[PDB]
Design a protein around this ligand. Structure first.
Ligand code: NA
Length: 240
């Protein structure tokens, strides 16, 4: 997250760190959201590589023991069947991961609440992106979980020529684009939290940014719109 601030350690208890085994150690690769005690939602492009993955819940500092972490292996990966890895802009950038064990809920570990199907945010709606991704274009991952305030940019604007044009689809949500704050590498897969009727819900899964840099004016971060996939999610969980 570029232009973020450190999150309080109990602010975003559905956030997870997806990590891969890197020799003797593990390394953060992307974010996700806990949506059942044994299921995680993330971006399809995060699990494109044939790596060994684990999920960490209750994480705050990637480089220190917080006393709150639970570590759990990934048993099954279900990627959206229309996902195509060389066309991120076609959409369907969403995957569900079934965990080997169910995690225990507490003030650091909670299920993400999803929006009702079909729900679309009005332009300029207040939202936060959270994650451990790079803190600057071509920079290094954050140590501690970061948050940034990114108001939504509606489809009519985002899909206009000086923004994203045809690369943004109605199955996506855009937010930010002020040139100071944005998503960045390592934030993929993680949540966009938006406050609606008094309650934060996860409306977006972080999908892509501009190749010209993370925080570029009129290139808002693009998220998979979770409210377009509620039936899909429910069908997967019920059939596995
Ligand atoms: Na830690």
């Amino acid at each position: 997250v570029v232009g973020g601030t450190e999150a309080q350690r109990n602010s975003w208890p559905s956030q997870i760190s997806l990590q891969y085994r890197s020799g003797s150690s593990w390394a953060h690769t992307c974010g996700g959201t806990l949506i059942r005690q044994n299921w995680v939602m993330t971006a399809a492009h995060c699990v494109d590589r044939e790596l060994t993955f684990r999920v960490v819940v209750g994480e705050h500092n990637l480089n220190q023991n917080n006393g709150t972490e639970q570590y759990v292996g990934v048993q099954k990966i279900v990627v959206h069947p229309y996902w195509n890895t060389d066309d991120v802009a076609a959409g369907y950038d969403i995957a569900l991961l079934r965990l080997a064990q169910s995690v225990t809920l507490n003030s650091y570990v909670q299920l993400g609440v999803l929006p009702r199907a079909g729900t679309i945010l009005a332009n300029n709606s207040p939202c936060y992106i959270t994650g451990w991704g790079l803190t600057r274009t071509n920079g290094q991952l954050a140590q501690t979980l970061q948050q940034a305030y990114l108001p939504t940019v509606d489809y009519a604007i985002c899909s206009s020529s000086s923004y994203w044009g045809s690369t943004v689809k109605n199955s996506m949500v855009c937010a930010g684009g002020d040139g100071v704050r944005s998503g960045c590498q390592g934030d993929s897969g993680g949540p966009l939290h938006c406050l609606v009727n008094g309650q934060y819900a996860v409306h977006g899964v972080t999908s892509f940014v501009s190749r010209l840099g993370c925080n570029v004016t009129r290139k808002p971060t693009v998220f998979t719109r979770v409210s377009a996939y509620i039936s899909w999610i429910n069908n997967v969980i019920a059939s596995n």
